[model samples]
Target chain A: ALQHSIREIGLRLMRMKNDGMSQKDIAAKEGLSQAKVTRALQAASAPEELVALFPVQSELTFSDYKTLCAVGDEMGNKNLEFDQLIQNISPEINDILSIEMAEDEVKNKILRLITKEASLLTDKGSKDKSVVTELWKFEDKDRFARKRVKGRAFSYEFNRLSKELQEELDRMIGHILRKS
Target chain B: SIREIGLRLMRMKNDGMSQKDIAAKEGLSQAKVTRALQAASAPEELVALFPVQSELTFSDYKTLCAVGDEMGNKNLEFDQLIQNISPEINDILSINEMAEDEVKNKILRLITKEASLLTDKGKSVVTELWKFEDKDRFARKRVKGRAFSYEFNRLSKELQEELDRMIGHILRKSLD
Candidate 1:
């Protein structure tokens, strides 16, 4: 998945950071801001063992990964050896990620695993009912890319993409409009 | 009376009588018969707008026919609008006792105004089977149900032609 590739890149960049590379230097080399690099690093911040379990969606951004890492950290605070806690929940994590789940859904399921709660999953399902239509779904090789529906005066959100990709998307949209 | 004259003329013509022959027989010009035929062709929805069909001039009926034709063109139901204005049509014609032309124009105006209100903003958006910066204007127009009018001014002729062709090819299937 694209998100897994991003996490791999973030992990490699951490190896570079260990070689004493500055955040500013990494940003210049990667053509990303320090903040973006920091957020991207959040995906890598999850324990190496726990990160292996979730199938991060391509459409899931670095920020969503940040939320996932936060859940991991929250779980660590509750357990003495978070790595051991992840090992015990490894089967449960695999089971949760095996289902086709949204980023929030994955986060909630992981949080539920940490606390042994069932109510979190049901709450997410109830909120999705008001969305009356699915206008389009973008899937890259059956992994999610983007989602949209036309129940309101809706516009596509291009905010989650990397800066370069966002610019390219905007340019392509503008080019199509000039000719359409 | 217009229907009588118009239908009689049509029956006569159908029975092998020419307009000139009918004109000669009725002591009227061929043009008068032709105009009466046009008046008779006015849809019942339009004819009902007036109190007396006989008092309506051929030109008035022609205008009424044009209104009816526009309503039909817009795919709006004629009876629906006419039914809603039934009381107003009666009030103006009977108690107000307006002149034939005044009554005709008022009813036509009411029908047109209501039709425009019901249609001009958006039309039949229930069917489901079917943008940028300075180009943000296009999105605005589309939201208002008026995107078809956005002119693609900056595109090259070849680009426009290719795009136009693609649109034609895709939309051609909508006929089904």
Candidate 2:
């Protein structure tokens, strides 16, 4: 079976944990060994900055995460940020950081940067990279309780979009309303 | 449609609708809008159990969810209870149509047995608490108006008949 990327696995585990599943319980449910669950969770607990550095379908293994955690810890203890860690990985994370649900303006800027980087690595990457389906879209359905105490029941026919997109967009519109 | 709108109002809040603009957009007084938006988001099944409008207050719906949430999370307690039971026992309502404590207890006990593997229409455990009424109310009304909201068709046949009867029953009840 094709396993989910480590980040995705970790994120799923984190979600189950948030929903009150112990790692052991998750291990049992996910059919993975407990150590694998722990390592995946360790990756999940890694800073968002670090998680964003790897490719979406990263090939990095558990030991790689262990090494990175050690380095991140060493840097943390010295009171220095990744300001002087690895050469390329440290410089710009905001590009990938906010891109999960990044606004177009930020997304465009980040895509340009990634495209530039990819030019030296792969030939197929481009400005169109962001068009992948469900890319930038989040599964907000499970983020909050599906129904509010007073909201309408979600019927089989109801159309659902990425959770809170409308909310955040409205906030953006609020900025526009304020400006206008 | 009112349910949809009430839900939309809730979604609007979730969508970051302004506290002020919400009323303006919904064509209602702010207080009613605010009160309602905060009042209703039970599981679809829970919503299905009761008919529209006067069927249940928001808190009534919430209390059901709260109960479901607790029972669902305590999976093992449910596990032990359901272990020896047969799946056929899930049909506790067909035998006696009373809403007695004993009846509800049978319903609850059956639910506990099935809780570990129970997944109704993809609802979370907490949201599914209302299945207690939903499964039991499998009787139909008048064979009669069989014409109800399109939403009713999503229900099991037993549930659909049961729903109309429940609705008719409530129509007869007085708050006093």
Candidate 3:
């Protein structure tokens, strides 16, 4: 999966942390904040033995890994080795923890958010295409497509996305909004 | 007349039209449709509130339903904690004939509420489906689905074409 193998850059950063690098230094080196550096390290807490058992969702964030590390630590204290612990934990938390799980729900909400948000941006051309592209799933068109709508509501839902993603979408819409 | 409307509601239910679909098709409020159908099925002990009046609005019908639902059991989600609360939801079954704009506004208000409740994808679909309401603020003006397709086939093809310019946009737009 493009998702599974893509984080070695993250892996390399952790190796640097293991080499006795201060987190502040690592943040300075990586051009990020200390908070982000701290969160990213949470993923490293999962035990090394059950590498194959980790649920590697593309959008799982630092909080998820952080929580998992707590779980890992608790299991570690119980002295159940990684092999047994991985099997014992419930898998449903993956849905509770990650964004990759709700593709349709997210994109449909995005479609609505695009219309409402584009007006907030300074765009020139029509706002339809960039809006759709910004919210589509590669797997297929989603369950939201199954229902009819009057294209309203839930504007605050844009709050659901990462601040960076929201800004990127804003830029795309604004990029097209006031173009030559 | 309310009795006749009740009969018609029963026929429609028997015909398999949902309370929601019937409300839309009849241009009535959902709360009205739901109450009428509910009134049709309740026990005889749930009699009329304003038995003399042939028609009623939401507040009118709900007081009746709440009273009935609370006859002994608070089984009904009475809208509030009021110690009191109807007859057959029937008298309220036939909605009082209100102005068309009155109907539209109530429906729009409900639609607006539902919009806030939908999943993100559901909200977007609604946004796409009701551009008039979303962009123009014309809440009453709905482009019905079958005709919606016909008009969409001819709609702002130019902007669509402009957007159609780039195909490989990819799923780069990740909220994650």
Candidate 4:
């Protein structure tokens, strides 16, 4: 209940700031400390995608979003890696988000996905977050296909590739490697 | 015994002894030897969660090792869920002197339930698109690990297309 209350106040602060109400003005009017107001605003500043994962953006504690934003920032800036990661896991995130489970369970699921995405990008160094690996996925009602790259190697794993397609891909890979 | 066996295997391997040789010498199957070593190799953080390394069973190590891998791979739900209750779990074990089996049982149940929820949807890495209709209520999408249809409202069609193209371009660009 306290967590819920923090979220509510934080959202109100964010709305006030968007409405051109100054933090100092809100702090003075609400009799809340400016530091508290600042932290509340920071909590509201998480990415909209992440914010949307909550049933109501304000359901998560202000402290949770504040930390979530910090985790995203850890992913790096202007990097395609982060974008791809969000794209890959954003759907899975929403699945976990929609489930009517315990708040703790949902929070853990969300954190794990983001942490995993960030972990993959680790050891690649900070200079080039552009695109070291590309993850391509395709599926149908019963079939699954994925193409993933790690370092200089590209591997395709699929359960339903046609024999012809598999042979073709093998030949292509052979030719490609020969060229290299 | 698992940790002891694992440590001895590791020491032997480090000292230029082969796994097959160790297995033969110790009267253990090579597979068993390998698994023991993996159990010992579990993350130190998680290993500390238990009372003592010696008391850790092979099955316990296997479960905790999964937690460690998931933590690294970003499938950290098990770790997170368990960790939330872990302080209390630790307290019960140390202070209340609860049976270790009872504590382990609770942890395993939590992990088992979490895993079921994950599989309730479907597998990972592969995603299915354009298979769900409004009538299906996103059930198929859920199975395929796709986002809900309502979320599409967050972006314009053109923007979504552009983002898709951008992703494609990035993936293709990296091919060279």
- Indicate which candidate wins on TM-score: 4
List candidate 2 segments past 4 Å from native: A1-3, A55-57, A77-80, A83-180, B1-176
lDDT tens per residue, model 3, A63-83: 544544454454333332332
Number of the predicted model whose lDDT against the real structure is largest: 4
Candidate 1's TM-score on the B chain: 0.56
Each model's lDDT comes to 0.51, 0.42, 0.38, 0.54
TM for chain B in all models?
0.56, 0.35, 0.28, 0.49
Give the DockQ of candidate 4.
0.02
True contacts kept of each: 0.00, 0.02, 0.02, 0.02
Docking class of 3: incorrect
Question: Where does the lowest 10-residue lDDT sum fall in candidate 2 chain A?
Answer: A145-154
lDDT of 4 at A53: 49
Measured against the true two-chain complex, the DockQ scores of the candidates, in the order shown, are 0.03, 0.02, 0.03, 0.02
Give the TM-score of each candidate: 0.34, 0.23, 0.23, 0.35
B141 Cα displacement, candidate 1 (Å): 21
How good is the docking of model 1, by CAPRI class? incorrect
Model 4 CA deviation exceeding 4 Å by range = A1-22, A55-59, A77-82, A90-101, A125-180, B1-176
- Deviation in angstroms for B124 in model 4? 29
* CAPRI tier for the interface of model 2: incorrect
Candidate 4 residue pairs in backbone clash: A116-B74
Model 1 spans > 4 angstroms off: A1-149, A153-180, B73-76, B97-101, B115-176
Deviation in Å, model 2, residue A173 alpha carbon? 28
